[PDB]
């Protein structure tokens, strides 16, 4: 049957990682060049969190983004009255001169008085990546260098080719958002190098990441602004080009979509490279009440599952995201695809499904970890189609990704009774009106990829062990090479 079944998530996720207890907050991926793998520290979130002492740094290890190994608690919160009562995002770097990993992080004071610093950067080190010792005498207060007392967080650490260590910190100078730069030769003495970049208008870029890839410098960052809540980027051929993008609010977007790389279900993305590939890790939020259509009024729930994506540099230096090769390989078992139900103008024809304005086709039940591929050809580039999940033959409501070629964007929406728009993901519509679609699922977390242009993370409770559906809202489509694979 293709009746709606009441699926639920396992405590843990193995690919779009979540530990057995708690959720994955802001990650901090780092390629450990001694062990030759990625150590992804992340802020461990719990439901609920302590009031003052929350968000310790746990870690997980992976070579490839598909299989993870948990490392447990690495840097504990401080005491209730310490400056690092709560811990916020930071940045690891290995120092070969003393054979110590250094993790800089945000210490978050509980109930800071007016004079006290809410947010201060602090550090721990480790010889193996297992035992971490806090440096109880190191504090980097923005205040000291003319920056903000309470917004001063998310230290990012990188070494240029000159060998100099740099640290970028999300802050404000008299109201306006600035990314602050500090430099050091030895990771211990730090000097202020002024402002690296301005933040546009009244925006606030959390979790900044700066890296070079081919012949381009990039800034990745997550936008705090309530209406955005998406991972964005800028680019420049030189480091001075990069900085110039936001200078005086110059708005030099890297592409036709403001550099928005995904939508509001992928936040806090930061990157790391193994020499071959550069991946990005963010989190896919939970939803209140496990309700796919409750996406928050101002903001999504903070933290959820870890989501690895792969950076695709195009030849104009523009970036999009696709799947990690190792996640694609994980799906070994082919599954029969078969129509369980039709509606309106819908024709099957050997192994090709043709749908017109208002038509629907529902396929057989998915499994728990799914890969879904298919090619869609539209009539025009004003056509609209839908990829729907948790859609049983008895479901009055369900959740679809709408691809609206007229509006040059995909949307996540609730369909049926109580339909509603939720949010969207601008991408480049194919000229040839062909859409090579690929979707990867671990339980309730999935990413949808089209034509190496779209990368759309979504939280979809109960997509597992439930049917899925294609439809056509406008014009006409033709669906081809439909496959489903599992593990
Ligand atoms: O009241 C505590 C309670 O709130 C949550 C759920 O939102 O956590 C946020 C809480 O975590 C901290 C300490 O680890 O670190 C946050 C790290 O995450 C980043 C990027 O996501 O930003 C914070 C995130 O929080 C919001 C919450 O709505 O922060 C709003 C808050 O930010 C300030 O600017 C000061 O933090 C205030 O102006 C404002 O009232 C959201 O808009 C942001 O995206 C990184 O930037 C950061 O390192 C704290 O900074 C934060 O308060 C629960 O998990 C927890 O139980
Ligand atoms: O209400 C937000 C909703 O808009 C939708 C619904 O249609 O839009 C978000 C969507 O819109 C863009 C389109 O570019 O921009 C959003 C802008 O909102 C803000 C906040 O007000 O813009 C103000 C506006 O003023 C300029 C000056 O010519 O600037 C002055 C500027 O300088 C400062 O003084 C500080 O230096 C600031 O305080 C002032 O704001 C204009 O250029 C500027 O555009 C800006 O932060 C954004 O411009 C998209 O970027 C965004 O995705 C819906 O999605 C939202 O819910
Ligand atoms: O009421 C939602 C309904 O609005 C539309 C109207 O065409 O789109 C979204 C609208 O919001 C932005 O994302 C940013 O302001 C823009 O991309 C766009 O102008 C529909 O698509 C949706 O179905």
419 lines ligand 3 (CB under 6 A): no
Token pair belonging to 383: 């056509």
**What's the CA-to-centroid distance between 268 and ligand 2, angstroms?**
21
- Given a contact cutoff of 8 angstroms between Cβ atoms, the answer to whether 263 and 255 are in contact is no
424 lines ligand 3 (CB under 6 A): yes
Q: Which ligand is nearest to the CA of 172?
A: 1
| C-alpha atoms less than 13 angstroms from C-alpha of 41 in its C-beta half-sphere | 27
- CA 487 from chain centre, in angstroms, equals 23
- Given a contact cutoff of 8 angstroms between Cβ atoms, the answer to whether 180 and 192 are in contact is yes
How many other β-carbons are positioned within 10 Å of the β-carbon of residue 484?
A: 22
421 lines ligand 3 (CB under 6 A): yes
- Given a contact cutoff of 8 angstroms between Cβ atoms, the answer to whether 440 and 339 are in contact is no
421 lines ligand 2 (CB under 6 A): no
442 lines ligand 1 (CB under 6 A): no
Sign (positive or negative) of CA dihedral 346, 406, 231, 229: negative
Q: Render 82-147 in DSSP notation, one character per residue.
A: STTSEEEEEEEEEETTTTEEEEEEEEE-SS--SSS-SEEEEEEEESSSS--EE-TT--B-GGGGTS
**What's the CA-to-centroid distance between 396 and ligand 2, angstroms?**
37
Q: How far apart are CA 441 and CA 469, in angstroms?
A: 15
| C-alpha atoms less than 13 angstroms from C-alpha of 203 in its C-beta half-sphere | 21
Resolution in Å equals 2.7
Technique behind the model: X-ray
- Given a contact cutoff of 8 angstroms between Cβ atoms, the answer to whether 191 and 144 are in contact is no
- CA 179 from chain centre, in angstroms, equals 21
Sign (positive or negative) of CA dihedral 249, 255, 261, 264: positive
H helix or E strand, kind and range, residue 239: helix 239-244
- Based on its alpha-carbon atoms, the radius of gyration of the chain, rounded to whole angstroms, reads 23
Q: How far apart are CA 107 and CA 485, in angstroms?
A: 44
Best substitution site from 27, 87, 88, 304 to test ligand 1's pocket, by max atoms within 8 Å of Cβ? 88
Q: How far apart are CA 296 and CA 288, in angstroms?
A: 8
**Burial class of residue 428 (count of CB atoms within 10 Å of its CB; 0-12, 13-18, 19+):** middle
- Given a contact cutoff of 8 angstroms between Cβ atoms, the answer to whether 412 and 438 are in contact is no
Best substitution site from 201, 255, 409 to test ligand 2's pocket, by max atoms within 8 Å of Cβ? 201
203 lines ligand 2 (CB under 6 A): yes
Q: How far apart are CA 373 and CA 400, in angstroms?
A: 16
Q: Render 453-467 in DSSP notation, one character per residue.
A: TEEEEEE-TT-TTS-
- Given a contact cutoff of 8 angstroms between Cβ atoms, the answer to whether 117 and 149 are in contact is yes
226 lines ligand 2 (CB under 6 A): no
Token pair belonging to 484: 């489903």
Best substitution site from 227, 254, 411, 412 to test ligand 2's pocket, by max atoms within 8 Å of Cβ? 227
Q: Is the backbone peptide bond immediately before 48 cis, with ω within 30 degrees of 0? A: yes
Q: How far apart are CA 436 and CA 132, in angstroms?
A: 46
Tell the residue nearest (CA) to atom 30 of ligand 2: 201
């Amino acid at each position: 049957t293709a009746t709606y079944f009441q699926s639920s998530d396992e405590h843990g996720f193995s690919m779009y990682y979540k530990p057995q207890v708690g959720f994955v907050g802001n990650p901090m991926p780092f390629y450990d060049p001694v062990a030759k793998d990625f150590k992804v520290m992340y802020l461990q979130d719990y439901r609920p969190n302590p009031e003052a002492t929350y968000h310790p740094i746990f870690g997980v290890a992976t070579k490839d983004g598909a299989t993870y190994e948990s490392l447990g608690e690495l840097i504990s919160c401080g005491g209730r009255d310490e400056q690092d009562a709560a811990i916020g995002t930071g940045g690891t770097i290995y120092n070969p001169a003393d054979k110590l990993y250094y993790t800089f992080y945000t210490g978050n004071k509980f109930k800071p008085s007016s004079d006290q610093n809410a947010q201060v950067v602090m550090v721990a080190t480790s010889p193996d990546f297992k035992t971490w010792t806090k440096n109880r005498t190191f504090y980097l207060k923005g205040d000291t260098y003319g920056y903000d007392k309470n917004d001063f967080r998310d230290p990012f650490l990188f070494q240029t080719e000159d060998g100099v260590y740099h640290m970028l910190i999300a802050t404000r100078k008299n109201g306006k958002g600035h990314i602050a730069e500090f430099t050091s030769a030895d990771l211990k003495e730090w000097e202020s190098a002024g402002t690296f970049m301005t933040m546009m208008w009244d925006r606030f870029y959390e979790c900044p990441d700066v890296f070079k890839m081919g012949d381009w410098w990039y800034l990745i960052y997550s936008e705090q602004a309530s209406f955005m809540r998406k991972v964005q980027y800028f680019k420049g051929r030189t480091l001075e080009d990069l900085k110039a993008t936001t200078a005086n609010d110059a708005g030099i977007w890297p592409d036709n979509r403001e550099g928005m790389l995904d939508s509001r279900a992928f936040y806090a993305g930061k990157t790391a490279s193994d020499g071959t590939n550069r991946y990005i890790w963010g989190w896919c939020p939970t939803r209140a009440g496990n309700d796919n259509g409750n996406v928050g009024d101002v903001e999504p729930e903070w933290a959820g599952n870890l989501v690895a994506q792969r950076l695709i540099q195009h030849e104009d230096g523009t970036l999009t995201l696709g799947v990690p090769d190792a996640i694609d390989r994980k799906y070994t078992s082919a599954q029969e695809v078969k129509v369980m139900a039709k509606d309106g103008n819908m024709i099957e024809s050997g192994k090709t499904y043709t749908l017109g304005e208002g038509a629907s086709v529902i396929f057989n039940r998915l499994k728990v970890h799914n890969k879904i591929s298919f090619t869609v050809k539209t009539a025009s580039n004003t056509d609209r189609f839908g990829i729907s999940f948790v859609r049983g033959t008895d479901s009055a409501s369900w959740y679809s990704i709408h691809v609206n070629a007229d509006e040059g964007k995909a949307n996540f929406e609730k369909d049926g009774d109580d339909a509603k728009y939720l949010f969207d993901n601008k991408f480049n519509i194919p000229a040839d009106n062909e859409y090579r679609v690929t979707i990867y699922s671990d339980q309730s977390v999935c990413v949808t990829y089209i034509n190496d242009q779209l990368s759309f993370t979504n939280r979809i409770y109960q997509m597992q062990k439930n049917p899925w559906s294609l439809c056509c809202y406008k014009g006409e489509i033709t669906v081809s090479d439909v496959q489903v694979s599992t593990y």
